[PDB]
Design a binder for this molecule. Structure first.
Ligand SMILES: [Cu+2]
Ligand SMILES: [Cu+2]
Ligand SMILES: [Cu+2]
Ligand SMILES: [Cu+2]
Length: 464
């Protein structure tokens, strides 16, 4: 008896047009051992906030933690003032309200803390939620859409625990170098759950919610996954894949076929990232079991999903360069600690607090690096040349187009709307546009979403 896949509640506005989110500490159970955990409207993780394009919503956010936090809407095109970056402090026992005017296409976004220097810890403790953005275009497609039955979120996260059962988080020279990772995999907060799905198409909204671990989804019997959406929404047409790499903070929506009497697992395949192939991640690892139900599912896999505009002209666009770097001392000490603890398998398939940088500077909250233009395409050039680590590079306030992903044209399923781009020892270029302002007091962030990198300086602020 695997536990069933937890299904985050779908939260819409009340008669006052408000949604209430309470941030607080509780407890969860992992492998029958109790752990202090944090959640939104609960003990762990959070609800799925459902939003409609063209409507405004007010969110009331109550911080019932004993420490400061912020609430960021990853993937949402909102002004700086409500972005919930590190300047969006919510005092312990306090409340902050933000009004979000939703004006982007349907997509699966998410929300998590952005506390300065502590984002990794606060996510590791359990805070993350989802955002389901709806529009009238997607609803015409007749996709699987029964929340919790044939349309389900799949939030995949690793943790490690101490002997006493508690989550064992640490920001130290090793994790500042290579990230915080664990030996336990969670699926919507549960260990290897099962999900019962009707016969036909099953829609999975995949989120990599790990601090530092990249994933690569596949099925145990190699039935294909049909990618229908990325971070920023629908692809123009479904893209069939047999494996689906997903970086930290990235989302993809896939359809998978379900057939009577043939259960299969969603799995994650070993990755070529430092430290991420330590047993049992050295082999395919189950994520969840899909249990077919002999009832007909109504969803369709349409031939055409949406219209994706051509890439604009690059001639004349403002270019911005973002050179990522890591202090050589950090690389050396951090990698030495890693190799010493785990040995060769840590490279299988191959003051630190301000040692990670962009354009030679560790994140300065007091000093945005530049001011971007509102409403114009820019070409941002982000480089990991000179560094061996993986950096999923994320830009707030936008959904962009990838021109080049780590020195190559992007894969078809990655050629649409994205808020993250891989940077690993090569150069990425993206075409970005900001439709909302962000002042110095509530600046947008651009950073690596390997959270321990972010927390030790690999972030910049920018205004619009
Ligand atoms: Cu973000
Ligand atoms: Cu807007
Ligand atoms: Cu490095
Ligand atoms: Cu990084």
């Amino acid at each position: 008896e695997r536990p069933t896949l937890p299904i985050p509640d779908l939260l819409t506005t009340d008669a006052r047009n408000r949604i209430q989110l309470t941030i607080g500490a509780g407890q969860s159970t992992f492998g029958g051992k109790t752990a202090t955990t944090w959640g939104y409207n609960g003990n762990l993780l959070g609800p799925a906030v459902k939003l409609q394009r063209g409507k405004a919503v007010t969110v009331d956010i109550y911080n019932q933690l004993t420490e400061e936090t912020t609430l960021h809407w990853h993937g949402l095109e909102v002004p700086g003032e409500v972005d919930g970056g590190p300047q969006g402090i919510i005092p312990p026992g306090g409340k902050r309200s933000v009004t979000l005017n939703v004006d982007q296409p349907a997509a699966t976004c998410w929300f998590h803390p952005h506390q300065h220097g502590k984002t990794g810890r606060q996510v590791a403790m359990g805070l993350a939620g989802l955002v389901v953005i709806e529009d009238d275009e997607i609803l015409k497609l007749m996709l699987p859409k029964q929340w919790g039955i044939d349309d389900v979120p799949v939030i995949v996260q690793d943790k490690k625990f101490s002997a006493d059962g508690q989550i064992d988080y640490q920001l130290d020279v090793m994790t500042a170098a290579v990230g915080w990772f664990g030996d336990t995999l969670l699926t919507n907060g549960a260990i290897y759950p099962q999900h019962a799905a009707p016969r036909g198409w099953l829609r999975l909204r995949l989120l990599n919610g790990c601090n530092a671990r990249s994933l690569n989804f596949a099925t145990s019997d190699n039935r294909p996954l049909y990618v229908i959406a990325s971070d920023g929404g629908l692809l123009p047409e479904p893209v069939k894949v047999s494996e689906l790499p997903v970086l930290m903070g990235e989302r993809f929506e896939v359809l998978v076929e379900v057939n009577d009497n043939k259960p299969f697992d969603l799995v994650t395949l070993p990755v070529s990232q430092m430290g991420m192939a330590i047993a049992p991640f050295d082999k395919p690892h189950p994520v969840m079991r899909i249990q077919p139900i002999a009832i007909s599912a109504s969803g369709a896999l349409p031939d055409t999903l949406s219209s994706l505009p051509a890439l604009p002209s690059l001639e004349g666009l403002t270019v911005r360069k973002l050179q990522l770097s890591m202090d050589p001392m950090l690389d050396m000490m951090g990698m030495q600690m890693l190799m010493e603890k785990y040995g060769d398998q840590a490279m299988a398939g191959m003051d630190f607090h301000h040692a990670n940088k962009i354009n030679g500077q560790a994140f300065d909250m007091n000093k945005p690096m530049f001011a971007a233009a509102k409403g114009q395409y820019e070409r941002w050039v982000i480089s990991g040349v000179g560094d061996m680590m993986l950096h999923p590079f994320h830009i707030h306030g936008t959904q962009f187009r990838i021109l080049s992903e780590n020195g190559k044209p992007p894969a078809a399923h990655r050629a649409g709307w994205k808020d993250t781009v891989k940077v690993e020892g090569n150069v990425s270029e993206v075409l970005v546009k900001f439709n909302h302002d962000a002042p110095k007091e509530h600046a947008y962030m651009a950073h690596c979403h390997l959270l321990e990198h972010e927390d030790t300086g690999m972030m910049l602020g920018f205004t619009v």
